[PDB]
């Protein structure tokens, strides 16, 4: 048993800091030099740091100088960083890892993190609009058909959507939220037979927690226009 | 700081049998002791990474036979002989012998190689509320296709745009082995006023013959 | 035999109970010293690995990094401020309570033992005349001394050391399981094996120091008998024999030597195999502990070290359980004698003090045994009655009633049945002092004490003034000679001062006997060994002193007895017959039967000495060096492998580097146990076939060297035997020991001061600063837990004088009741060595704790200044472990190596008294083998002109122109006054000295040109009292004659002349009847007819008959006359005669006084001369 969790994740405003945490459990805590390293999205593993974790002997990389600062906390056995005067580009996936103080350099960081995610946005907890996305007027030449809803516009993360109220799991589709201009845009899709729809019911259940909406939009074909 | 280029970029490996993984640094990974230090990096994702095999040889206290590494100087190879289906996450090479960045490698996803297919197309035009409330958004739906190298064309009025494009793919279905993805354009209300014929394309290998969609604005 | 603790806790006062109980606490709080100050050591290389890692990672950190390194550092820097304080904490606390502890119990141990002491003394001076005769007096000295210093040994220092130890064993496996318990136990698994020669390595160091002549006590037995018996061996010979037979006992003292030292090696060899094979077991299993993330090297430091200093603490305690066992044993039977009690108790003050006492005395019908042995009766149904100035004087057959009538009137036994009555009240019912200031005795033998004249009249009675003591020296005709010697009364008097002789010794005990004024007077035969020309005077000054007095006389020789008022005779302890002499003489009973009867080294010379077994010395020197080497080695091999945890290497690779560190400390084991076991073996057996070899040199020459040799006062017979015993093993240490310390001290400190100037130059100035301090804690460490620091025993030599005075002559001291005055002075001798005891427990408690402080600074000192230069990367940390475990560690082997080993001052003054003996010259050498050696049997002997001076005294003068003529088989007897020199002849005749001037002749040849083995062989001495060797009776008898084969049968016709043959046939085990202290004790005149045996088995043709005053046997006084008488029928005779009966017979007698004969002839014509002879055949005739 070694295990290093972390903290859950977090939604800071820019400007202001936020501090996140590496909880270690199940050997010598004072000994191994915790790394924290840096994760984007698509990119590669970028090195923030460490601690010496026996007194707290940072050593920064020299492009988080100054904007990350590192600490500890031997009683309860967790390491800290906070990272100050964020940006956009600081949101990211942190991770810690744990390597052995007697051979560093020569021997794998071999204990991970889960990773703790930090959003940096800038926006305020904003309603969603819900769309629907019917097929395109005109021909239904095929007997698959592909119904749509797409929530645009929302924040923050995340937005619980479902199709039919859960009775409907049949090509079921949730893409990840694309970014746009400070606020999230989510889709949806599935795939149902040309005599199910618009012979049956159908409909898109939106739930966002923060600003407590439970949309509900029921999708009817293009009509005229 | 050792640049690493890790050379697969997705490795589509099938069911029970050997995928190789390659690893291409910058500079000579030789120490002065006769030892070369890189490390391999099991990630699935939600969960920690595992160490996996350290120095290009050797094996970590407690992973199968599965997992054994080959090469030297500046050229490496991990070995997934025999696979299960219990090891696809994405695989990455630590590190720079020549410290204090600790470069690590870029990443190696894995795969079941499902035989190839060609995806389903379908244009949505902006919404209704849309049209009241002030955007547009045509959404370019592309779903249950192989591999994931696929390139989307939007054309307006047989004229490129390359900018307001919003792209989207999904992950790994682990029951149908295929991927989807989707894009979208919004723009200002106005500009709906402006264009007529809206077309969607798909460029991928399975076909020569892109596939278009389109839509003009007029008719219904 | 074991006093309860608490018991044992008899004597201490309220305050001693304070200081054994602060001592006590400060035992606690100083044993949990050490272990923590390791937990300190583990923090602080925890703070340099650490921090060593970190800048021996990034190394690779251009650009600048100026500041970065030296950062790093500076982490190191201000972190090393506040360890120096905990450092100089440890320190500073530890100086006060190691002062404390160590004062307290050695002040605490002065009390208690001054007090034991002092009351020890009372409670033997206060005990009974029977318990004295049960309980043997030279082993009962030896017990005053012996015991209490046991005690005085277990009861202070070493139960405060065992506080000490057990604290810090406990406060070691405290920090120990709460660091880390699982190398705890893999300790714990072998720590029975390390506590165990832990246990024996400290129980083989402490002493060490006594238990080194048991083996050697049989063989200085031999010696010392011999030696006291000096005047018989160099006169029958067999100073071969004896050399041979102390050879023999020599060799077994060699083997069982040699065995003890080889034991003692093995037993150091497994101590050392086992700590370096611990190292191994704990650095490969700690090493392979952190090399898995889980211990530091920190906590493997301190939770290795701090258990190892436990379990190695536990056998540190070993000792000292069994020195408070062995000080509970001995307080046994010093606290069973100072309970209880006498029944007469001389100090009480009970009964009644009747004044104006006239002294009507009074016996009735007493029975009395003697509590030896109650069998035997010694007097029955005996009665007597003397009225006031009334003289009775007891006399019949000797041993029966005479002399224990005087020792029942001092009360010194109680009767078993009848009564003893003063004044018609009863004795028992007046108090003893009182009793025995009344009553004036005068003993056979007198007794001086080792004090000035007018110093024994104190003793007398203390209160008297100068001028009293002139009177009572005046009424005891003693003022006219003591006015006449030379410094006046202030003249020391005693073994230490001139000799006086036996009449001068006599009437100034008269002289005490007058100044105490006593109303009864008491002499137990005041004049049996007494000559005739002092017994005038004598008889004189007892005839003033009788005037007014009741006494009570028990005299031989009854001349003067005649004026007394009565005469008492016995028989079977009953007066058979009572009255004047002239009834006496009518009854014709036994009184008329006697009448009737009657009438520098130069050093080199010492390794010259031992330069017969030079290969031993060659393989110990290069088997030294060898152990020189492994003490760097030691700290080598440490710093490598903590110098190999402070870097960043490979995994693999530090795990084969200390795998080859941990073989190479289990080498160092291997070849450290070999190399002193035989080191130990080489220089063992070096030094004591050294010492066998030397006391045999030694003992041939002192058994060649004349008697003149042996009146040396210098040269007594403790001086001697203690000598010989002494240096003859101490000079083991001058040659062999010092060349194992100078090459173990020189490859160790050498070979430490230059490869720690090889890899840092500047920490080893400031450590050699240190390296005389601690290495002084190292000796004085060593000299502390060696006990040898402590005792001395040469101050109390000033206090044993006066103790063993009291002890030995009990008899007196109770019979003038001075126990008082003995306690006094005793008390005042035994209280300024006190007062110093007392100073210098302060002295040694504030070095102890001050040294041992500085090796707790010396640990700070020594690691702020390493962290400023490990700061400034001009040196790393494996180089300040390397200089500092060198130096240090290296200073404090060279203190436990120059500390361990013997001396060096005592060896060289040893060597020094042994060379200057053994090749000592003699004068009248025996060992010679020149000289005429005729086949004359004739033995005329012939004295002309002989003028000799004894050697001890050269002043005064003895023999001046003796010439006397003995011819063939005549019998010629000597006889004379008082320093005439008559006892000279025999000792001139058999050639132990020349004299100055005059010759002495052999049968027309003078002796000086004869071999001396020759004319002792034909001589037969016959002494006075006879000396009897442990040995059975057939070698004995055989000790006569020498170099001959001598036949079994050939012992049976001596001892029938000797007439001992008749009485040896009823005996157990006729003549292989062992004799001496365990077999049959025989009776001096059945001894006497021995002696008459060994000289008869010679054969000799010249017989000296060397016999005195008086027999009181009565049973074998006829059969030593009748073997003498069978002995001189047919011999040349030359007899020293006190006996008035052998000298009719003779057939010339000799008169010497002041060296000068006065007249020849036989005894009825000198009787005619009317002379000196007839004089002295007249004074019988009264
Ligand atoms: O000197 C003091 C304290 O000294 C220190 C204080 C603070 C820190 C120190 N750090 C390193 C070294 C000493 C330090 C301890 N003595 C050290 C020397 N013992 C001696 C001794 C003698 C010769 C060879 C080895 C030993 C060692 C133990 C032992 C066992 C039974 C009987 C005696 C002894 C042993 F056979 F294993 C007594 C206690
Ligand atoms: O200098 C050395 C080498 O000893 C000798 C070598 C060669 C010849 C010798 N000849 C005579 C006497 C000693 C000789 C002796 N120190 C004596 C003092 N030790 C102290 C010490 C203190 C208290 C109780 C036990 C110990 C013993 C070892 C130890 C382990 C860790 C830290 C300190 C020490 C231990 F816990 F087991 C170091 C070795
Ligand atoms: C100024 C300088 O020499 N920096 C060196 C660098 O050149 C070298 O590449 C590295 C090890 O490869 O160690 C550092
Ligand atoms: C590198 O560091 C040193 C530190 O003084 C500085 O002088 C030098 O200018 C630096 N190099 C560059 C290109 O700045
Ligand atoms: C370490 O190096 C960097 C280089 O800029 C410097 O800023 C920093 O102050 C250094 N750390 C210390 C404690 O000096």
């Given at each position: 048993e070694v295990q290093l969790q972390e903290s859950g994740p977090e939604l800071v405003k820019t400007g202001a800091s936020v501090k996140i945490s590496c909880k270690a459990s199940g050997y010598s805590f004072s000994n191994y030099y915790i790394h924290w390293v840096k994760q984007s999205h698509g990119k590669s593993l970028e090195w923030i740091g460490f601690i010496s974790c026996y007194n707290g002997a940072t050593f920064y990389n020299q492009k988080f100088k100054g904007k990350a600062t590192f600490t500890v906390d031997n009683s309860s056995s967790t390491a800290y960083m906070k990272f100050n005067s964020l940006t956009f580009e600081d949101s990211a996936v942190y991770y810690c890892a744990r390597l052995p103080i007697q051979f560093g350099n020569f021997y794998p960081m071999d204990y991970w993190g889960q990773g703790t995610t930090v959003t940096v946005s800038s926006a305020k907890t904003t309603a969603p609009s819900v769309y629907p996305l019917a097929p395109v007027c005109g021909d239904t030449t095929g007997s698959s058909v592909t119904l749509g809803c797409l929530v645009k516009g929302?924040?923050?993360?995340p937005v619980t959507l479902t199709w039919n109220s859960g009775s409907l799991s049949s090509g079921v589709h949730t893409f990840p939220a694309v970014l746009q201009s400070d606020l999230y845009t989510l889709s949806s899709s599935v795939t149902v037979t040309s005599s199910t729809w618009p012979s049956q019911s159908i409909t898109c259940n939106v739930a966002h927690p923060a600003s407590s909406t439970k949309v509900d939009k029921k999708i009817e074909p293009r009509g005229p226009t | 700081q050792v640049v690493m280029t890790q050379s697969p970029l997705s490795l589509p490996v099938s069911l029970g049998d050997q995928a190789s993984i390659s690893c291409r640094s910058s500079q000579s990974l030789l120490h002065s002791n006769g030892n070369t230090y890189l490390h391999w990096y099991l990630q699935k994702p939600g969960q920690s990474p595992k160490l996996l095999?350290?120095?290009?040889?050797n094996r970590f206290s407690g992973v199968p036979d599965r997992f054994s590494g080959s090469g030297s100087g500046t050229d490496f190879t991990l070995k997934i002989s025999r696979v299960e289906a219990e090891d696809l996450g994405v695989y990455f090479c630590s590190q720079s012998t020549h410290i204090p960045p600790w470069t690590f490698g870029g990443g190696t996803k894995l795969d079941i190689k499902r035989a190839d297919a060609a995806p389903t197309v379908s244009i949505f035009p902006p919404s209704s509320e849309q049209l009241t409330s002030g955007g547009l958004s045509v959404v370019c739906f592309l779903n249950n296709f192989y591999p994931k190298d696929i390139n989307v064309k939007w054309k307006i009025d047989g004229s490129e745009r390359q900018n307001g494009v919003l792209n989207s793919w999904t992950d790994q279905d682990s029951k149908d082995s295929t991927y989807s993805m989707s894009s979208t354009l919004t723009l200002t209300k106005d500009e709906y006023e402006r264009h007529n014929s809206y077309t969607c394309e798909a460029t991928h290998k399975t076909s020569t013959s892109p596939i278009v969609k389109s839509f003009n604005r007029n008719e219904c | 035999p074991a006093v309860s603790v608490l018991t044992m806790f008899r004597y201490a006062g309220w305050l001693d109970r304070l200081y054994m109980l602060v001592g006590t606490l400060a035992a606690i709080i100083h044993g949990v010293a050490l272990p923590l100050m390791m937990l300190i050591f583990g923090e602080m290389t925890d703070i340099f690995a650490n921090a060593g890692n970190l800048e021996d990672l990034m190394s690779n950190i251009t650009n600048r990094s100026d500041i970065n390194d030296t950062g790093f550092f500076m982490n190191l820097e201000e972190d090393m401020t506040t360890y120096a304080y905990y450092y100089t904490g440890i320190g500073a606390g530890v100086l006060i309570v190691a002062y404390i502890q160590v004062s307290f119990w050695l002040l605490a141990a002065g009390r208690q033992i001054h007090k034991i002491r002092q009351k020890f003394f009372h409670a033997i001076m206060n005990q009974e005349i029977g318990w004295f005769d049960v309980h043997d007096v030279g082993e009962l000295n030896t017990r005053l001394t012996d015991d209490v210093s046991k005690i005085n040994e277990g009861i202070g220092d070493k139960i405060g050391m065992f506080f000490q130890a057990m604290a810090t064993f406990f406060g070691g496996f405290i920090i120990g399981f709460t660091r880390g318990w699982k190398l705890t136990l893999v300790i714990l698994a072998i720590s029975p094996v390390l506590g165990l020669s832990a246990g024996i390595w400290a129980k083989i160091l402490s002493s060490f120091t006594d238990k080194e002549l048991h083996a050697y006590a049989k063989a200085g037995a031999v010696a010392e008998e011999v030696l006291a018996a000096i005047r018989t061996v160099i006169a029958f010979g067999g100073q071969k024999k004896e050399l041979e037979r102390y050879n023999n006992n020599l060799e077994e003292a060699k083997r069982l030597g040699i065995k003890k030292a080889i034991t003692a090696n093995i037993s150091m060899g497994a101590a050392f195999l086992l700590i370096y094979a611990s190292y191994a077991l704990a650095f490969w299993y700690g090493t392979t502990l952190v090399l898995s993330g889980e211990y530091s090297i920190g906590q493997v430091l301190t939770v290795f070290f701090s258990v190892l200093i436990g379990a190695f603490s536990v056998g540190q305690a070993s000792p000292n359980i069994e020195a408070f066992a062995n000080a509970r044993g001995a307080a046994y039977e010093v606290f069973k004698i100072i309970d209880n009690k006498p029944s007469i108790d001389s100090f009480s003050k009970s009964g009644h003090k009747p004044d104006n006492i006239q002294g009507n005395l009074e016996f009735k019908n007493i029975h009395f045994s003697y509590p030896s042995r109650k069998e035997v009766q010694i007097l029955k149904g005996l009665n007597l009655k003397v009225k006031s100035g009334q003289t009775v004087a007891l006399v019949g057959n000797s041993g029966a009633g005479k002399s224990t009538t005087v020792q029942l009137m001092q009360r010194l036994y109680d009767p078993l049945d009848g009564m003893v009555s003063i004044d018609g009240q009863d004795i028992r019912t007046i108090n003893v002092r009182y009793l025995r200031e009344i009553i004036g005795v005068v003993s056979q033998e007198p007794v001086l004490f080792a004090t000035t004249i007018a110093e024994n009249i104190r003793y007398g009675r203390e209160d008297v003034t100068m001028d009293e003591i002139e009177k009572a020296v005046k009424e005891a005709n003693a003022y006219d000679f003591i006015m006449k010697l030379p410094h006046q009364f202030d003249t020391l008097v005693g073994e230490r001062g001139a000799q006086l002789s036996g009449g001068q010794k006599q009437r100034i005990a008269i002289a005490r006997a007058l100044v105490r004024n006593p109303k009864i007077l008491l002499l137990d035969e005041a004049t049996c060994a007494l000559d005739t020309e002092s017994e005038a005077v004598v008889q004189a000054a007892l005839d003033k002193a009788r005037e007014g007095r009741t006494t009570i006389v028990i005299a031989h020789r009854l001349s003067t007895v005649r004026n007394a008022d009565v005469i008492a005779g016995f028989d079977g302890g009953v007066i058979v017959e009572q009255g004047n002499h002239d009834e006496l003489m009518r009854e014709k009973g036994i009184y008329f039967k006697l009448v009737m009867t009657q009438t520098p080294a130069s050093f080199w010379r010492i390794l010259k000495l031992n330069s017969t077994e030079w290969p031993y010395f060659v393989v110990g020197i290069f088997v030294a060096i060898i152990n020189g080497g492994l003490q760097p080695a030691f700290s080598v091999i440490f710093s490598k492998i903590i110098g190999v945890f402070t870097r960043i290497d490979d995994p693999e690779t530090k795990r084969q580097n200390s795998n080859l560190f941990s073989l190479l400390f289990l080498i160092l084991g291997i070849i450290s146990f070999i190399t002193f076991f035989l080191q130990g073996f080489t220089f063992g057996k070096a030094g004591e076939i050294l010492t066998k070899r030397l006391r045999y040199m030694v003992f041939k020459s002192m058994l060649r060297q004349d008697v003149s040799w042996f009146d040396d006062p210098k040269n007594t017979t403790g001086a001697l035997t203690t000598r010989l015993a002494n240096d003859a093993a101490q000079v083991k240490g001058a040659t062999g020991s010092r060349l194992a310390v100078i090459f173990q001290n020189i490859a160790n400190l050498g070979t430490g001061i230059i490869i720690s100037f090889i890899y840092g130059w500047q920490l080893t100035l400031l450590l050699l600063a240190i390296v005389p301090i601690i290495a002084i804690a190292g000796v004085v460490e060593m000299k502390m837990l060696s006990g040898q620091?402590?005792?001395?025993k040469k101050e109390l030599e000033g206090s044993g004088k006066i103790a063993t005075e009291a002890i030995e002559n009990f008899r007196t001291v109770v019979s003038l009741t001075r126990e008082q005055k003995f306690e006094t002075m005793y008390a005042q001798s035994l209280q300024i060595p006190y007062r110093n005891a007392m100073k210098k427990a302060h002295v040694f408690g504030i070095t102890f704790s001050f040294t041992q402080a500085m090796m707790y600074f010396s640990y700070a000192a020594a690691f702020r200044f390493g962290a400023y230069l490990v700061a400034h990367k001009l040196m790393s940390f494996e180089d300040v472990l390397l200089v500092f475990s060198a130096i240090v560690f290296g200073a404090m082997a060279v203190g436990q190596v120059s500390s361990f080993a013997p001396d060096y001052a005592k060896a060289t003054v040893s060597a020094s008294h042994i060379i200057r003996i053994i090749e000592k010259t003699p004068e009248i050498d025996s060992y010679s083998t020149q000289g005429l050696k005729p086949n004359m049997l004739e033995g005329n002997v012939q004295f002309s002109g002989v003028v000799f001076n004894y050697p001890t005294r050269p002043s005064i003068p003895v023999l001046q122109g003796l010439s006397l003529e003995v011819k063939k088989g005549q019998t010629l007897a000597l006889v004379g006054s008082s320093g005439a020199g008559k006892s000279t002849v025999v000792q001139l005749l058999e050639r132990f000295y020349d004299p100055m001037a005059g010759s002495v002749f052999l049968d027309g040849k003078e002796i000086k040109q004869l071999n001396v083995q020759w004319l002792r062989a034909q001589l037969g001495i016959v002494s006075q009292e006879p000396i009897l060797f442990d040995t059975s009776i057939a070698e004995n008898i055989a000790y006569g004659d020498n170099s001959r084969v001598v036949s079994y049968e050939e012992i049976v016709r001596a001892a029938k002349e000797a007439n001992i043959h008749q009485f040896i046939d009823s005996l157990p085990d006729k003549y292989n009847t062992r004799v001496g202290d365990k077999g049959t004790q025989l009776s001096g005149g059945q001894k006497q007819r021995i002696a008459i045996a060994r000289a008869l088995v010679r054969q000799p043709h010249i017989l000296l008959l060397d016999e005195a005053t008086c027999a009181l046997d009565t049973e074998s006084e006829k059969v030593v006359q009748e073997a003498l008488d069978k002995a001189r029928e047919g011999r040349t005779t030359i007899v020293i005669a006190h006996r008035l009966s052998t000298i009719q017979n003779a057939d010339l007698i000799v008169v010497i006084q002041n060296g000068k004969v006065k007249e020849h002839g036989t005894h009825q014509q000198l009787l005619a001369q009317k002379g000196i002879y007839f004089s002295m055949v007249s004074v019988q005739a009264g």
């Open positions: 929302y924040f923050p993360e | 095999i350290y120095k290009v040889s | 620091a402590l005792k001395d």
